[PDB]
Amino acid sequence: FPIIQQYKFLRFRRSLLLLVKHSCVESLFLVRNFCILYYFLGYIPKAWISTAMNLHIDEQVHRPLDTVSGLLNLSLLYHVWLCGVFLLTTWYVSWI
Amino acid sequence: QAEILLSNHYTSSEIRVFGAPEVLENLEVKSGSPAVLAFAKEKSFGWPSFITYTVGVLDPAAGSQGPLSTTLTFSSPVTNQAIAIPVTVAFVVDRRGPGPYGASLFQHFLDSYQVMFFTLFALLAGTAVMIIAYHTVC
Numbered sequence: 001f002p003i004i005q006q007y008k009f010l011r012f013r014r015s016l017l018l019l020v021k022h023s024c025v026e027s028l029f030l031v032r033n034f035c036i037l038y039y040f041l042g043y044i045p046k047a048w049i050s051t052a053m054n055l056h057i058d059e060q061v062h063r064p065l066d067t068v069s070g071l072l073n074l075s076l077l078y079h080v081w082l083c084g085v086f087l088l089t090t091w092y093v094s095w096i
Numbered sequence: 097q098a099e100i101l102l103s104n105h106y107t108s109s110e111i112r113v114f115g116a117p118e119v120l121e122n123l124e125v126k127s128g129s130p131a132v133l134a135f136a137k138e139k140s141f142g143w144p145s146f147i148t149y150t151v152g153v154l155d156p157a158a159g160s161q162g163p164l165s166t167t168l169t170f171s172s173p174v175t176n177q178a179i180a181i182p183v184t185v186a187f188v189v190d191r192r193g194p195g196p197y198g199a200s201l202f203q204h205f206l207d208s209y210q211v212m213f214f215t216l217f218a219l220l221a222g223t224a225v226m227i228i229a230y231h232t233v234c
Contacts, residue, residue, distance in 0.1 A: 041195075041196070041197050043195050044195030044196045044197040045192065045197060045198030046193075047189070047192040047194045047195045047199075048192040048194070049191065050188060050191065050192035051192050051194060051199075052190055054104050054105075054191070055192070057188050057193075
């Protein structure tokens with residue numbers, strides 16, 4: 001509970017700017033941590049949607065994301081970070 | 097067929113060996129790998145004379161380790177004629193190409209479903225008993 005009661009719009013307008021800064025930093029840490037997790041484990045999922053459904057892997061057109069020189073793709077890393085900012089911000093807006 | 101390709105979309109192929117009838121009756125077939133088989137589907141001795149062989153993989157896991165290249169040799173001891181066809185086996189393994197993580201949830205959710213319901217009913221019985229114990233002590 002707040003030590004000081006305040007009109008809902010002021011209480012939210014003050015927290016929203018702190019939240020969007022937090023979501024941007026926390027998404028960047030979650031993407032960085034997931035990039036390390038995928039470099040050690042990505043082959044295994046990426047080895048459960050190709051075995052009883054039927055799918056091929058394009059070893060000619062796309063560099064596999066198990067590789068450091070696929071996983072450092074700046075366009076992927078931007079859109080995945082932005083997705084994490086949308087996710088964390090909408091979920092923390094519900095919580096706030 | 098001058099070469100054969102076997103894969104997720106083409107798990108077998110059908111090749112015709114042509115010749116004279118006597119050479120086709122006395123036609124051996126020999127694979128360079130026990131993971132690849134061929135069986136005679138039909139014989140025609142009427143012109144043009146042939147035998148159709150359906151060629152396929154006995155074990156898809158032999159194709160999981162990499163592109164298995166082999167030969168399929170058809171040979172007739174009556175004329176000492178032989179023809180050897182390359183066979184490439186390329187199975188990019190079929191609801192994704194294992195390891196430890198991914199698969200290990202949704203299979204276990206079906207294997208363990210009786211233990212999941214038993215533990216759910218044991219937790220519902222345990223919480224019901226704790227609520228009855230509260231309403232007899234508090």
